[PDB]
Design a protein around this nucleic acid. Structure first.
Ligand SMILES: Nc1ncnc2c1ncn2[C@@H]1O[C@H](COP(=O)(O)OP(=O)(O)OP(=O)(O)O)[C@@H](O)[C@H]1O
Ligand SMILES: [Mg+2]
Ligand SMILES: [Mg+2]
Ligand SMILES: [Mg+2]
Ligand SMILES: [Mg+2]
Ligand SMILES: [Mg+2]
Ligand SMILES: [Mg+2]
Ligand SMILES: [Mg+2]
Ligand SMILES: [Mg+2]
Ligand SMILES: [Mg+2]
Ligand SMILES: [Mg+2]
Ligand SMILES: [Mg+2]
Ligand SMILES: [Mg+2]
Ligand SMILES: [Mg+2]
Ligand code: NA
Lengths: 75, 65, 116, 151
RNA sequence: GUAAACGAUGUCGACUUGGAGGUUGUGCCCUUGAGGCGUGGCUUCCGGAGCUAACGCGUUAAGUCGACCGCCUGGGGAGUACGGCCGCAAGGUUAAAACUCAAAUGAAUUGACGGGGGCCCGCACAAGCGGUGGAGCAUGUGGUUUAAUUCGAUGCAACGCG
């Protein structure tokens, strides 16, 4: 992997996430931000939202509550 | 060494029994001495012992302490 | 299996490790653990804390037999000599009599050289 | 240090609030003797923190401080010429001092807007357990737990 | 057939104040009770006179004497070469010279030093704050250059110095 700028110190603004997928609610609580340099592994059983959380952080699954945030210069 | 000691409640009290052979003998038999270093060590150890009486001999000073 | 009632603990300490073995009263080993295998490779497996960890790691994984009384036998003087009986008693065991067996020759075979 | 001792340096308490912890906070985060420039920063931060929290003094500072103050930390205590770190039990007086330094460093990082806003965001994150300041506490806890062998 | 085979002190004998002990015999006695009173053999430590360069030795002398034996004559060359004797061998024992230097050597004294010890101190380490080392420019210094790049200071304690 090459070298990026890695500027933004607040990686994202996370608050009252309430990720649901529409029909139901998947996740509502959340954890510590990614705080550049942190390395986190998501444990958990199957059908528990490990992929909903990844897509929510990626920005392809708008939370029903809203305002999931993402820093200005994140690649 | 072997102790039952039912009378205390989780009190080791095996210090007295462990202070018989384990501390000294095994530490001694870990390496070979020389057959002539033991005699020198014993002579020096017992020459230092008689210095205890020489230290005792030094009390008879006022020393203003 | 077989629900053994009263067992024997072997605490083989040394200047480099501390192996704890739980067996029956006849000498058939039930389960063993070691400070080095507890994830303490190096100089850190000589500390009494590693021996404490190994004692609990051996008390666990042998509940298949449900032992209530343990006769501890201590061998190989080292850092993990008195710090392991408390770790065993902090696991739900009856430490009845703490035997201390340790090989002592009566001036037997010649020891190795003295280091420098 | 070698022989002598010190009582303490008495500090004038906070002007607006009847406390000295905030005055020491101002002292920690000022620079070049610009106390009148640090005062506006700290008071603006505590202004914009209360509106987001729901309380003025306790929830503004203490709840964000007790989630970042350390408990144990590592110090070099070699015996035989090695370099391994020996964890030690930190003292209650130094806990707040360490916590405030960590919070101010986290707020000096996180460059978005004026410092009066950076500190406010960093303190809300501290109060929720969401900042770099609490990450430092968790890291030092990890180090102490890993070196818990020596005691 | 050699060792730091060493109390680095040949064997034998006589004489010359004391103290604290260890181990092994014996007579007397209030073993009348884990005791006292004397006398021999061996042995450990400290110490008087005396002796000694000093360190130290000091009734088990390195003190005062007698008998007999062994050995020494500046440091290297050298316990080496040659020769003889012994040895299965490795080697052992006896044992020089030419040449070369004006010194080698012992004990103790004052310092200095120790990756020897003990006790204290110093913004010495630790706990912190702010910097230099990177870029622009100022100043000094070495280098290189030039007709001259005037002379001096050049570890700490020269280099915004005369
Ligand atoms: N597109 C979707 N529409 C509706 N429900 C969905 C959708 N995708 C996932 N879900 C539901 O959301 C829950 C979690 O799905 P998700 O794919 O995030 O699982 P996961 O915990 O990450 O596990 P896995 O390892 O299977 O991906 C499940 O109950 C699943 O049925
Ligand atoms: Mg070995
Ligand atoms: Mg020879
Ligand atoms: Mg000879
Ligand atoms: Mg001899
Ligand atoms: Mg001789
Ligand atoms: Mg004769
Ligand atoms: Mg003497
Ligand atoms: Mg010869
Ligand atoms: Mg010959
Ligand atoms: Mg000599
Ligand atoms: Mg520069
Ligand atoms: Mg010049
Ligand atoms: Mg100056
Ligand atoms: Na998934």
């Amino acid at each position: 992997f090459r070298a990026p700028e890695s500027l933004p110190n607040p990686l994202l603004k996370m608050e009252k996430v309430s990720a649901g997928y529409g029909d139901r609610i998947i996740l509502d609580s959340i954890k510590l931000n990614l705080v550049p340099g942190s390395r986190i592994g998501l444990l958990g059983r199957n059908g528990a939202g490990k992929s909903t959380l990844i897509k929510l952080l990626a920005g392809e699954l708008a939370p029903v509550s809203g305002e999931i945030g993402l820093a200005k210069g994140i690649k | 060494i072997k102790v039952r000691e039912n009378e205390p409640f989780d009190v080791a009290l095996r210090r007295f029994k462990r202070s018989c052979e384990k501390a000294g003998v095994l530490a001694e038999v870990r390496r070979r001495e020389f057959y002539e270093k033991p005699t020198t060590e014993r002579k020096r150890a017992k020459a230092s012992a008689v210095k205890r009486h020489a230290k005792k001999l030094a009390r008879e000073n006022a020393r203003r302490t | 299996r077989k629900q053994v009632s009263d067992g024997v603990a072997h605490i083989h300490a040394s200047f480099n490790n501390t192996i704890v073995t739980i067996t029956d009263r006849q000498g058939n080993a039930l389960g063993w653990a070691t400070a080095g295998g507890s994830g303490f490779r190096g100089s850190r497996k000589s500390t009494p804390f590693a021996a404490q960890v190994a004692a609990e790691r051996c008390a666990d994984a042998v509940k298949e037999y449900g032992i209530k009384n343990l006769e501890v036998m201590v061998k190989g003087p080292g850092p993990g000599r008195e710090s392991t009986i408390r770790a065993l008693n902090a696991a739900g065991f009856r430490i009845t009599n703490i035997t201390d067996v340790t090989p002592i020759p009566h001036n037997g075979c010649r020891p190795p050289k003295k280091r420098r | 240090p070698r022989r002598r001792v010190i009582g303490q340096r008495k500090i004038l308490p906070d002007p607006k609030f009847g406390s000295e912890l905030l005055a020491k906070f101002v002292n920690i985060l000022m620079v070049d003797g610009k106390k009148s420039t640090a005062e506006s920063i700290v008071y603006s931060a505590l202004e914009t923190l209360a509106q987001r929290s729901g309380k003025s003094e306790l929830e503004a500072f203490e709840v964000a401080l007790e989630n970042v103050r350390p408990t144990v930390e590592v110090k070099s205590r070699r015996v035989g010429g090695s370099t391994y770190q020996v964890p030690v039990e930190v003292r209650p007086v130094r806990r707040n001092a360490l916590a405030m330094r960590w919070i101010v460093e986290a707020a000096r990082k996180r460059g978005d807007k004026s410092m009066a806003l950076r500190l406010a965001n960093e303190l809300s994150d501290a109060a929720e357990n969401k900042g770099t300041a609490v990450k430092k506490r968790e890291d030092v806890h990890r180090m102490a737990e890993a070196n818990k062998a020596f005691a």
